[PDB]
Symmetry: C2
Subunit: 97 residues, 2 copies
């Protein structure tokens, strides 16, 4: 159930931000950035993922399109794990991402 609760919570957060206004199935990059920075504030990159992390977060600043769907939102979460979670420290898999 732990994964059930976790996945339910990831959809909850998406609904919170996407449901603000307009298309309830889409986010702007700015909303996605805000989401990540506020909901995952304590998450910071690991040793060899610092540069990858920064480029990722700058892209969310630069890019200002609003076609971010749920799948892309979740992908961003995955990317943050590869950058900030110690388990993936030595992962020779350069962020997809």
């Amino acid at each position: 159930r732990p994964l059930e609760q976790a996945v339910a919570a990831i959809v909850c957060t998406f609904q919170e931000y996407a449901g603000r206004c307009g298309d309830k199935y889409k986010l702007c990059q700015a909303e996605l950035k805000e989401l990540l920075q506020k909901e995952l504030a304590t998450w910071t990159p690991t040793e060899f993922r610092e540069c990858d992390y920064n480029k990722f977060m700058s892209v969310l600043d630069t890019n200002k399109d609003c076609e971010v769907d749920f799948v892309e939102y979740v992908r961003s979460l995955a990317c943050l794990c590869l950058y900030c979670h110690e388990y993936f420290k030595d992962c020779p898999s350069e962020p997809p991402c």
Copy 2:
């Protein structure tokens, strides 16, 4: 809440991926097992039955072991589009 949730998604991946071999990879069979056991209560919505079935069959047919964390999480996302009521009317056909 999101921090706890994302931490838990990694926990589950570690649980399955850490069984043996490459700790950063899963086989499709392991992914299918993971989904079927960890999300047992999740079932498709009205207009997502066919998409759901095709997705779960692909995990049966394909037996490659190149499923990385990103692909694992993508599968979770896909299950949301299929099984979570919020996306019932989502005109976005599973990526997926």
